[PDB]
Design a binder for this molecule. Structure first.
Ligand SMILES: [Mg+2]
Ligand SMILES: [Mg+2]
Ligand SMILES: [Mg+2]
Ligand SMILES: [Mg+2]
Ligand SMILES: [Mg+2]
Ligand SMILES: [Mg+2]
Ligand SMILES: [Mg+2]
Ligand SMILES: [Mg+2]
Ligand SMILES: [Mg+2]
Ligand SMILES: [Mg+2]
Ligand SMILES: [Mg+2]
Ligand SMILES: [Mg+2]
Ligand SMILES: [Mg+2]
Ligand SMILES: [Mg+2]
Ligand SMILES: [Mg+2]
Ligand SMILES: [Mg+2]
Ligand SMILES: [Mg+2]
Ligand SMILES: [Mg+2]
Ligand SMILES: [Mg+2]
Ligand SMILES: [Mg+2]
Ligand SMILES: [Mg+2]
Ligand SMILES: [Mg+2]
Ligand SMILES: [Mg+2]
Ligand SMILES: [Mg+2]
Ligand SMILES: [Mg+2]
Ligand SMILES: [Mg+2]
Ligand SMILES: [Mg+2]
Ligand SMILES: [Mg+2]
Ligand SMILES: [Mg+2]
Ligand SMILES: [Mg+2]
Ligand SMILES: [Mg+2]
Ligand SMILES: [Mg+2]
Ligand SMILES: [Mg+2]
Ligand SMILES: [Mg+2]
Ligand SMILES: [Mg+2]
Ligand SMILES: [Mg+2]
Ligand SMILES: [Mg+2]
Ligand SMILES: [Mg+2]
Ligand SMILES: [Mg+2]
Ligand SMILES: [Mg+2]
Ligand SMILES: [Mg+2]
Ligand SMILES: [Mg+2]
Ligand SMILES: [Mg+2]
Ligand SMILES: [Mg+2]
Ligand SMILES: [Mg+2]
Ligand SMILES: [Mg+2]
Ligand SMILES: [Mg+2]
Ligand SMILES: [Mg+2]
Ligand SMILES: [Mg+2]
Ligand SMILES: [Mg+2]
Ligand SMILES: [Mg+2]
Ligand SMILES: [Mg+2]
Ligand SMILES: [Mg+2]
Ligand SMILES: [Mg+2]
Ligand SMILES: [Mg+2]
Ligand SMILES: [Mg+2]
Ligand SMILES: [Mg+2]
Ligand SMILES: [Mg+2]
Ligand SMILES: [Mg+2]
Ligand SMILES: [Mg+2]
Ligand SMILES: [Mg+2]
Ligand SMILES: [Zn+2]
Lengths: 112, 59, 150, 117, 140, 101
RNA sequence: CAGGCGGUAGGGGAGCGUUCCCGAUGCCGAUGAAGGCCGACCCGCGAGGGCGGCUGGAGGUAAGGGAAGUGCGAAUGCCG
RNA sequence: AGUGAGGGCGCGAGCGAUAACGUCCGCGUCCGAGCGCGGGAACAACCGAGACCGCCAGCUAAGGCCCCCAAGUCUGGGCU
RNA sequence: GUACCGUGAGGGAAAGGUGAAAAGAACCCCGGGAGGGGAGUGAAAUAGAGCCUGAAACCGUGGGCUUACAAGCAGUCACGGCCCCGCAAGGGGUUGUGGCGUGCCUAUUGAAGCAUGAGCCGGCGACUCACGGUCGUGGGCGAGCUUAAGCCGUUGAGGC
């Protein structure tokens, strides 16, 4: 038994967020709260808000107890990127890929 | 120069392989004495504003 | 419905060579040996067609499924009328039936029936014949039949 | 009537990716790579089905020569004793007895020993 | 039916004295005991051979004028790095190396082959550092 | 206590009540056949020249049946030559019943 | 029963699968159509075909024939 | 139908330099198409040998039988 | 004939599908919003509007086998270990060591070739048709065979 929350379409490159998530995967809910409170990365913001929304779900929706929670599993799926255009030299354009991510976090209880 | 160019697509392995030290490392945390809450060492605590006993920055 | 232009020069493009986009190699290109209209018909020889018509018919009497009739009793342009005339001639419609008569009023009636194919005599032919078992027929039609042969 | 390609190809490629399961990298994911890889396997096997035969043949002969060398004599004479003596136990079941039934082998050594002269 | 597979074997430790035996011709059969081909169940995919300890290595023989004229060659990796030291010099200074360098060449190359070399234990002169192993002296 | 028999043009070491498979035979799935002995031994130690005269082996042809098909390919390069034969090997499966030597 | 059976250019042969028509006012089909994903089972020398579980939600089409926009890995191919 | 670029080797000639993995004919072979198999360290055409499928069965061929490597540290006489 | 491209003549796209019915998700929870979790509608919500089915390349997370003295067209053959399905026999996954092993295509006397083409996946893509020849073949009639255009009839009916 567990509760999850998912930030779909967050406009940041998945490769960059996975680095973040990997910090917390498995940790206690309050280790996370601090791990992200001081991690030096954009994605910490977007990871945190999932974590915080996920936990809020787990208690306020699924019986659970905040001090019992830990990240059972997390993972950043990649989502549709915005293709845009970058004028290069000599008339060539290039296709820049502003990417996005689906950030999933899943916590659970652990009775000790 | 004559425009060096990679000659073979990187294997997925050799890609994933190079990244082997890209793994981020977590922040160094001490607990702030004056509040028992977590802060990065040798820095003035963001929460209580005390540092080395005295109260440095008011929060 | 495109244009003629050679989309990009013959050389130094570094792209593969082409001409117009209409070329069937492209998507939206023309079709290579795509169907045009045709006339599938021919003149299957008059002797053969005659010879077929015979054998078809003969094959029914060989099974004994041909049935000549002259009398169309109640039959008078209502289905029920024929539906009972059929009753009284081993035609409950277990087998499917080719009906061949001169008069309209009968084929009129038998028309809407889901095991009957009707037909003017002069249009009696071998696909509609082979298509069914029992083949029922006017005496006035049988006249034309043996006369459309010979 | 246009016979749109349809399911044929995707199905046909699929039956290959099947056969290519367990292959390294694209050789297990790319049709064009299975076919290549698979071409090889198909020849490699038939080559080795034909070869596997003369593999054991040698493994036996080693296990045999290793046994006559225990009873003084060598393989190349040990046989000619069997060939003279009229015995026709195969090299398979020779090396069989060699491990499993030493004393039986030793008896066989003796007939062939004798039979040479 | 299927061929017998060797379940698992306790190793066999030999004692061979090199003193007054031709180099190669000794190496030739040390190989086969290393390789373990001598045992009537032998199997080429696993390391069952005989742990051979060799003695009086430095006191080995060789024919011809080979003492002087047969030269060992090895190459560093740098230019002119071909080092070439004669046989004389070798057993003069690193004695045991001679017999080894000759056996390694008669052992199969790659994994198991190299593994087999590590079972061969060679000492120049009088005796060896593991009487504790209880090594059977073979006279071949 | 075994025997070295011959069948299918291959020699097999068999003991009583043995499950084994031989090269296909023409006998009944349920009947029996006598296999020749080339060498008997166990408590005895008989040697054939090439076959031991008196020694014979009973075998219940327990069931015929077909093997497991193997795709055997063939490929010649730069010539467009490829060939797929699927082949399953026929086999009769005997139960070794008893020895007579 | 005996014998032949390597094969490029290439000649011949026998089949498989796709699209459609007759078979069809029929037949299968929400007790689940087409397609998708699995399979160590079945049949076939093979191309294939069955079967079974999962998905899927509305179509599908026999035996036997017929007609073709009929089978792709390459074309610095075309599109995505 | 395809083919109308042949190649190497043996041998018989010319040309060449009694040169060339040279060239040009004649006879034959082999490769081509047998870059399938064994030898030849490896290696189209040298030696052996013409692969329908299967076998943990057997005789051989060239070549081999100290060890890597299957099988003689075989046997007798002689030379270096 | 739009976006867009060209001064211009002109060129010239891509882009369809929730469900029977909007019943298109009130209200609570985290959130700046996005978006998610409950609840709710539905026969079904991995039918939630970035909506039917939802393959592949490609990217993740968990699991099992596996790997840091081995060298390599990545396979194959054998053995062995650990893992899973089987009472058994058996299988399926993996691969440590051993045997053996010069990619596909085209073009070529000859290619692994340091010749050629291909990043990968999917989809599109190349021997047709009309007339007339000429063999072959299945039929019809046979010193004869056959109709063309058309006319009559049918609405997939033929006859003349
Ligand atoms: Mg910070
Ligand atoms: Mg409670
Ligand atoms: Mg708290
Ligand atoms: Mg710039
Ligand atoms: Mg890019
Ligand atoms: Mg790019
Ligand atoms: Mg605090
Ligand atoms: Mg236009
Ligand atoms: Mg006429
Ligand atoms: Mg007449
Ligand atoms: Mg023999
Ligand atoms: Mg033994
Ligand atoms: Mg001497
Ligand atoms: Mg001197
Ligand atoms: Mg001592
Ligand atoms: Mg001492
Ligand atoms: Mg000591
Ligand atoms: Mg008897
Ligand atoms: Mg219809
Ligand atoms: Mg219908
Ligand atoms: Mg229902
Ligand atoms: Mg279902
Ligand atoms: Mg289906
Ligand atoms: Mg079918
Ligand atoms: Mg069926
Ligand atoms: Mg089913
Ligand atoms: Mg059909
Ligand atoms: Mg493109
Ligand atoms: Mg010419
Ligand atoms: Mg050619
Ligand atoms: Mg070749
Ligand atoms: Mg080669
Ligand atoms: Mg060869
Ligand atoms: Mg050859
Ligand atoms: Mg020896
Ligand atoms: Mg003399
Ligand atoms: Mg709030
Ligand atoms: Mg808010
Ligand atoms: Mg919601
Ligand atoms: Mg409900
Ligand atoms: Mg559902
Ligand atoms: Mg359902
Ligand atoms: Mg959705
Ligand atoms: Mg949309
Ligand atoms: Mg989509
Ligand atoms: Mg999707
Ligand atoms: Mg999916
Ligand atoms: Mg290690
Ligand atoms: Mg390796
Ligand atoms: Mg290696
Ligand atoms: Mg389990
Ligand atoms: Mg089971
Ligand atoms: Mg088991
Ligand atoms: Mg297994
Ligand atoms: Mg492996
Ligand atoms: Mg295994
Ligand atoms: Mg290997
Ligand atoms: Mg005539
Ligand atoms: Mg006439
Ligand atoms: Mg006309
Ligand atoms: Mg009508
Ligand atoms: Zn504080």
């Amino acid at each position: 038994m567990e509760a999850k929350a998912i930030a779909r379409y967050v406009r940041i490159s998945p490769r960059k967020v996975r680095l973040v998530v990997d910090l917390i995967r498995g940790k206690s809910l309050e280790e996370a709260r601090n791990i992200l409170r001081y991690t030096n990365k954009r994605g910490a913001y977007f990871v945190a808000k999932v974590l915080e929304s996920a936990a809020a779900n787990a208690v306020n929706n699924h019986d659970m107890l905040e001090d019992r929670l830990y990240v059972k599993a997390a993972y950043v799926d990649e989502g549709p990127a915005l293709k845009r255009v970058l004028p290069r030299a000599r008339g060539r354009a290039d296709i820049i890929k502003k990417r996005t991510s689906h950030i999933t976090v899943i916590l659970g209880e652990k009775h000790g | 120069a004559k425009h060096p160019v990679p000659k073979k697509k990187t294997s997925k392995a050799r890609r994933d392989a190079r990244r082997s030290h890209h793994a981020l490392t977590p922040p160094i945390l001490v607990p702030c004495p004056e509040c028992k809450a977590m802060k990065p060492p040798h820095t003035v605590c963001p929460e209580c504003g005390y540092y080395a006993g005295r109260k440095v920055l008011e929060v | 419905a495109y244009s003629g232009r050679k989309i990009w020069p013959q050389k130094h493009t570094g792209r593969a060579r082409h001409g117009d986009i209409g070329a069937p190699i492209f998507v939206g290109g023309g079709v290579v040996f795509g169907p045009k209209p045709r006339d599938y018909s021919y003149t299957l020889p008059k002797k053969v067609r005659k010879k077929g018509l015979a054998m078809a018919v003969a094959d029914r009497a060989r099974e004994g499924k041909l049935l000549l009739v002259e009398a169309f009793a109640g039959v008078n342009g209502k289905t029920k009328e024929f539906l009972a005339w059929a009753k009284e001639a081993g035609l409950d419609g277990s087998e499917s039936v080719l009906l061949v008569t001169g008069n309209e009023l009968v084929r009129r009636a038998a028309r809407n029936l889901p095991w009957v194919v009707t037909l003017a005599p002069e249009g009696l032919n071998v696909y509609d014949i082979v298509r069914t078992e029992r083949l029922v027929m006017d005496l006035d039609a049988w006249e034309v039949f043996q006369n459309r042969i010979g | 009537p246009r016979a749109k390609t349809g399911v044929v190809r995707r199905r046909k490629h699929k039956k290959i990716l099947k056969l290519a399961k367990g292959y390294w990298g694209l050789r297990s994911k790319s049709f064009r790579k299975a076919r290549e890889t698979l071409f090889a396997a198909g020849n490699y096997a038939y080559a080795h089905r034909k070869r596997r035969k003369r593999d054991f043949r040698r493994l036996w002969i080693v296990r045999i020569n290793a046994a006559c060398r225990q009873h003084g004599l060598n393989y190349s004479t040990f046989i000619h004793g069997l060939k003279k003596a009229g015995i026709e136990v195969d090299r398979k079941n020779l090396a069989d007895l060699a491990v499993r039934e030493p004393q039986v082998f030793a008896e066989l050594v003796e007939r062939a020993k004798a039979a040479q002269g | 039916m299927k061929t017998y597979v060797p379940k698992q074997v306790e190793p066999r430790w030999v004692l061979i004295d090199a003193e007054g035996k031709t180099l190669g011709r000794l190496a030739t059969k040390i190989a086969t005991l290393l390789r373990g081909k001598h045992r009537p169940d032998w199997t080429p995919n696993v390391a069952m051979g005989d742990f051979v300890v060799v003695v009086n290595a430095d006191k080995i023989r060789v024919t011809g004028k080979k003492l002087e004229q047969k030269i060992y060659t090895r190459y560093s990796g740098y230019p002119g790095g071909l080092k070439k030291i004669p046989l004389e010099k070798m057993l003069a200074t690193h004695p045991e190396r001679v017999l080894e360098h000759a056996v390694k060449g008669m052992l199969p190359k790659g994994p198991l082959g190299r593994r087999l070399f590590k079972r061969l234990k060679v000492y120049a002169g009088p005796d060896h550092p593991h009487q504790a192993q209880r090594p059977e002296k073979l006279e071949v | 206590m075994f025997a070295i028999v011959k069948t299918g043009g291959k020699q097999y070491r068999v003991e009583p009540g043995l499950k084994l498979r031989v090269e296909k035979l023409d006998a009944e799935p349920g009947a029996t056949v006598e296999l020749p002995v080339l060498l008997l031994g166990g408590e005895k130690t008989v040697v054939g020249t090439p076959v031991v005269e008196g020694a014979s082996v009973v075998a219940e042809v327990l069931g015929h049946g077909r093997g497991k098909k193997i795709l055997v390919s063939k490929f010649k390069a730069k010539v467009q030559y490829r060939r797929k034969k699927g082949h399953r090997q026929p086999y009769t499966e005997l139960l070794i019943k008893e020895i007579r030597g």
